[PDB]
Amino acid sequence: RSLKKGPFIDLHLLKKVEKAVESGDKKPLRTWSRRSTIFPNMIGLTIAVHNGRQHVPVFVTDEMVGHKLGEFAPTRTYR
Amino acid sequence: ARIAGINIPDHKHAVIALTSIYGVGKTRSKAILAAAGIAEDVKISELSEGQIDTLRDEVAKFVVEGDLRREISMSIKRLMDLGCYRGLRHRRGLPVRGQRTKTNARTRKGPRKP
Amino acid sequence: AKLHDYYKDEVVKKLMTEFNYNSVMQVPRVEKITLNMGVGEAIADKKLLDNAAADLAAISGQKPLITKARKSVAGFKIRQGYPIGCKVTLRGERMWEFFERLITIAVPRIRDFRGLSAKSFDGRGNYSMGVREQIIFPEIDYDKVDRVRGLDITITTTAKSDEEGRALLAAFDFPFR
RNA sequence: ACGACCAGGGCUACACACGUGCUACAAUGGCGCAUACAAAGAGAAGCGACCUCGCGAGAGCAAGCGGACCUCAUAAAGUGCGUCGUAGUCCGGAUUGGAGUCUGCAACUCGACUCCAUGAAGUCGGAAUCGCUAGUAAUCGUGGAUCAGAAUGCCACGGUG
RNA sequence: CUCCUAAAGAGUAACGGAGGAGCACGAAGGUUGGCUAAUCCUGGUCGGACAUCAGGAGGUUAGUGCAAUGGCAUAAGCCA
């Protein structure tokens, strides 16, 4: 629901992703930017998204492109 | 009569009778009747079969029928299998679009149970 | 006898070489089409079963045969011998004149058509499929409809396996999803 | 450190109970076209016309206005004609899917709005209980504060009555 | 009344071991014609472990107005 003038992604996460894909398979990416959009060059990486207390590991697939990172890290515990 | 949308619309004003199709509202019904050439205030009776074939030819342009149900089921299933926030809200029958769950979630939660 | 004539001239010699049969008698045939209508709820009232069989009488032009319960089972709370459903078996050209009446009229009518299944075979070369709606036939008018009861249709063939079975109806251009 | 800085999360949870409201269940009405009559307000990191593009939210360009001057800003119930004809309906709009707009570093948790599609409950509400004595109740729109954005709340204004 | 005790003809006792009867039916009788189960598997609208349909397996494991025993396909079983 952001305008159609381009998606948003935090710059530090962008540079982390480029350094991760250019250097081959790496460790999970620890990030707090739940608001960043999942881009096609992130397919294959597992980003550890902060959820408030932990960094939830999220293995990115082609079906996730377009979502925000926080959509795969629930912040509230309910049983 | 019957349409490429299997469903059988009632014999009443064409603009409202075409709404019985799943996927055709008022705007799309008016657009179908305009692109076909039929008035909106004429009943489904008094319509020639050549005119109903015309309406079928126009409704064939839209994905409006069990096909649309299939595309909606596919999207909800993709959400649920992805495990995203909306997927979890769909799994538990809770409101998906940010509505409050403290009170007033009766459409998604159904009749209340103690 | 449209497909009946179409049977003895066209689908025999393509099948005769498709399976390399020695005699023409080895090709599968179509003995009978039997339409079953399991009412089940007629125990509440039997006025609805006669008109239910009145529909099946209009689909095939034959007076139906009211089936009775073979044994009491309480799981559906019936006594043995209760009128539980009607059926009609079709043989000869009345089977054929009906066999084209659905494959060319019964196929292009079902709501949200997706095609028939290729797995619904008995295992020895006999096909069976169920239609959910009765207003799919030209005979039964939409105006006169007290209920939306369906019915089962099974195809009895002299085929020995499902491969020979599916090959026969495929020759009649059967929708196979 | 019970002080201070930061990022993310929460205050928005959800078996359930209550208070206060909004929208309805329709024909004294819904929809379509045409047309009539207000008051009170706000505006400079603001109100923003006209014109062009967009189905629309809006966008581009760009006057005027620190304002009895310009803008917000088309009042709506009403009235005329047509249609619907008592049905879960051309009532009702919940919910959900898809596509977008704008603000904002940033709309995932958790914004408002638009378009297409879908069309829950609801057919007047048990025990009980509330407000109101006249331009009042009832009903219909309008504006402002807070405010980047976010009113069914609050505070005010007039129409019918 | 039926079975066992009862000792391969009959019969055979106990406060021995187990069960039933004190009816039903004008068809559930007569005759002629026809028919052949139980159960399970597979496929099939609602339909489900279990309804009706189709096929295969199976071969009487079913049925017999009612206890048990002996019978029953030429059916004594089922239908007209």
UniProtKB/Swiss-Prot annotation, chain A:
Keyword check for Ribonucleoprotein: yes
SUPFAM superfamilies per record: Ribosomal protein S19 (SSF54570)
InterPro entries: Ribosomal_uS19 (IPR002222), Ribosomal_uS19_bac-type (IPR005732), Ribosomal_uS19_CS (IPR020934), Ribosomal_uS19_SF (IPR023575)
Superkingdom field: Bacteria
Keywords on record: Ribonucleoprotein, Ribosomal protein, RNA-binding, rRNA-binding, tRNA-binding
MF GO annotations: rRNA binding; structural constituent of ribosome; tRNA binding
GO CC terms: cytoplasm; cytosol; cytosolic small ribosomal subunit
One GO-annotated biological process of the protein: ribosomal small subunit assembly
Subunit structure: Part of the 30S ribosomal subunit. Binds S13 and L5 and cross-links to the A site tRNA.
Family the UniProt entry places it in: Belongs to the universal ribosomal protein uS19 family.
Role noted for this protein: In the E.coli 70S ribosome in the initiation state it has been modeled to contact the 23S rRNA of the 50S subunit forming part of bridge B1a; this bridge is broken in the model with bound EF-G. The 23S rRNA contact site in bridge B1a is modeled to differ in different ribosomal states, contacting alternately S13 or S19. In the 3.5 angstroms resolved ribosome structures the contacts between L5, S13 and S19 bridge B1b are different, confirming the dynamic nature of this interaction. Bridge B1a is not visible in the crystallized ribosomes due to 23S rRNA disorder. Protein S19 forms a complex with S13 that binds strongly to the 16S ribosomal RNA. Contacts the A site tRNA.
Protein name: Small ribosomal subunit protein uS19
Organism per entry: Escherichia coli (strain K12)
UniProtKB/Swiss-Prot annotation, chain B:
Keywords annotated in UniProt: Ribonucleoprotein, Ribosomal protein, RNA-binding, rRNA-binding, tRNA-binding
PROSITE patterns in the record: RIBOSOMAL_S13_1, RIBOSOMAL_S13_2
GO molecular function annotation: rRNA binding; structural constituent of ribosome; tRNA binding
Region annotation Disordered: where it falls in the sequence: 93-114
Result, substituting residue 104 to K: In PW097; partially suppresses a rimM deletion
Assigned GO CC terms: cytoplasm; cytosol; cytosolic small ribosomal subunit; small ribosomal subunit
GO BP terms in the entry: cytoplasmic translation
Quaternary structure note: Part of the 30S ribosomal subunit. Forms a loose heterodimer with protein S19. Cross-links to the P site tRNA and weakly to the A site tRNA. Forms two bridges to the 50S subunit in the 70S ribosome, contacting the 16S rRNA and proteins S19 and L5.
NCBIfam families cross-referenced by the UniProt entry: uS13_bact
Function: Located at the top of the head of the 30S subunit, it contacts several helices of the 16S rRNA.
Family: Belongs to the universal ribosomal protein uS13 family.
UniProt protein name: Small ribosomal subunit protein uS13
Gene name for this UniProt entry: rpsM
Curated annotation (Swiss-Prot), chain C:
Name of a matching Pfam family: Ribosomal_L5_C
Gene Ontology biological process terms, A to Z: cytoplasmic translation; ribosomal large subunit assembly; translation
PANTHER family in the record: 60S RIBOSOMAL PROTEIN L11-RELATED (PTHR11994)
Gene it is expressed from: rplE
SUBUNIT field: Part of the 50S ribosomal subunit; part of the 5S rRNA/L5/L18/L25 subcomplex. Contacts the 5S rRNA; cross-links to the P site tRNA. Forms a bridge to the 30S subunit in the 70S ribosome, contacting protein S13 and S19.
Keyword Ribosomal protein (UniProt): yes
Domain of life: Bacteria
Gene Ontology MF, one: RNA binding
Name this polypeptide is given: Large ribosomal subunit protein uL5
Further information: Identified as a multicopy suppressor of the slow growth phenotype of an rsgA (yjeQ) deletion mutant.
Keyword RNA-binding assigned: yes
Keywords: Acetylation, Ribonucleoprotein, Ribosomal protein, RNA-binding, rRNA-binding, tRNA-binding
GO cellular component, one term: cytoplasm
UniProt similarity note: Belongs to the universal ribosomal protein uL5 family.
N6-acetyllysine modified-residue sites: 2
Organism (species): Escherichia coli (strain K12)
PROSITE patterns according to UniProt: RIBOSOMAL_L5
Protein task: This is one of the proteins that bind and probably mediate the attachment of the 5S RNA into the large ribosomal subunit, where it forms part of the central protuberance. Its 5S rRNA binding is significantly enhanced in the presence of L18.
